[PDB]
Amino acid sequence: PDFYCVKWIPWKGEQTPIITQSTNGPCPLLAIMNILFLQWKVKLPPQKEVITSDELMAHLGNCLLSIKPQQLNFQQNVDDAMTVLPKLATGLDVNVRFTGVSDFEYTPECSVFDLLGIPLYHGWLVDPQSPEAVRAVGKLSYNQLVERIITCKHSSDTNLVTEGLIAEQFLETTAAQLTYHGLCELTAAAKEGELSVFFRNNHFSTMTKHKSHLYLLVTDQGFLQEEQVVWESLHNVDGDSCFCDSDFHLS
Amino acid sequence: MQIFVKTLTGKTITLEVEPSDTIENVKAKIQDKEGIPPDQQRLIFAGKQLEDGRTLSDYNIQKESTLHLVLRLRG
Ligand SMILES: [Cl-]
């Protein structure tokens, strides 16, 4: 319903809760909250087996509203964060740029992440090895790309028409929204032991890098009983993905 | 009638609809046979975005018309 199961794991020698997800549940909220649990910035009592969206909001509120600044820029951000909280549960709008694993159109939505010090990533990157594609896509965000593709379809100008077709096949071939280059850059760009949020295919995940390896936190309700299953390889682009325990050992 | 929906992966799904059908019905049909949520759907035809309230005859969509679907990014 509107309840989420709590799962306890041995994280860095401590009993730590993480929250498991429905089928199409509240994954941004979850991606964020699970980071906060893993950092012990939010604590649940030992016997918590279930938690509600409202409680999560309350714990989240305690984080956001307890943050102190490095004046007026700061307070604006915080309300933009507050205003967005409901969308954290029902679906959040992102608009990636294909130039880099941190490149999004900056919106209020993104600001929550920034206030909590939580990096936000995607791996939907145009291959630098193909200059035609790099030129066509340029610095355009996804939303601009689909508009441009449309404009170009209506032109009979060869340049525009060519630009569009290249952009189209970029979107067609990379529709999984993760590329080998994105994967490599994620690898090199993410820092060891940092917890972050990874966008892909309209899902937000809790991500970390450990010994140069990238993992997504397993929140699937199916594995609620299996303590040994905590981390899943961010394995690209498709194929068998290995599971690890809390300590990043094969489970 | 039979129409075509072009998924970005390249696959072209075929759909059976009626000109009186609403855009909200068609997204529900694409979901019902491709699993993509109707909210994550944006329908494009002749360089126009289709709106959930209107019907197919409102855009003069005829048999074997190819509708373009764009995913909006919402996790
Ligand atoms: Cl961290």
Author numbering:
A (entry chain A): 111 to 180, 187 to 367
B (entry chain D): 1 to 75
Q: From the publication, what sentences describe this entry?
A:
Here we report the discovery of a new family of DUBs, which we have named MINDY (motif interacting with Ub-containing novel DUB family). Found in all eukaryotes, MINDY-family DUBs are highly selective at cleaving K48-linked polyUb, a signal that targets proteins for degradation. Our structural analyses reveal that the catalytic domain of FAM63A is a distinct folding variant of the superfamily of cysteine proteases. Collectively, our analysis of human MINDY-1 reveals that it is a chain-trimming enzyme, which uses the Ub-binding MIU together with the catalytic domain to cleave K48-linked polyUb chains from the distal end in a stepwise manner.
C-terminally propargylated Ub (UbPrg) is a potent and selective covalent inhibitor of most thiol DUBs and forms a vinylthioether linkage with the catalytic cysteine (Ekkebus et al., 2013). Refining the structure at lower resolution revealed that Ub exists in two alternate conformations (UbA and UbB), with each at ∼50% occupancy. The distal Ub rests on the stalk subdomain, and the region of MINDY-1cat that makes contact with Ub is conserved in evolution. The C terminus of Ub sits in a conserved catalytic groove, and L73 of Ub sits in a highly conserved hydrophobic pocket. Binding of UbPrg to MINDY-1cat does not induce global conformational changes in the catalytic domain, and both free and MINDY-1cat∼Ub complex superpose well (root-mean-square deviation ∼ 1 Å over 244 aligned Cα atoms). One notable difference between free and complexed states of MINDY-1cat is the movement of the Cys loop (β2-α1) that in the structure of apo MINDY-1cat blocks access of Ub to the catalytic site.
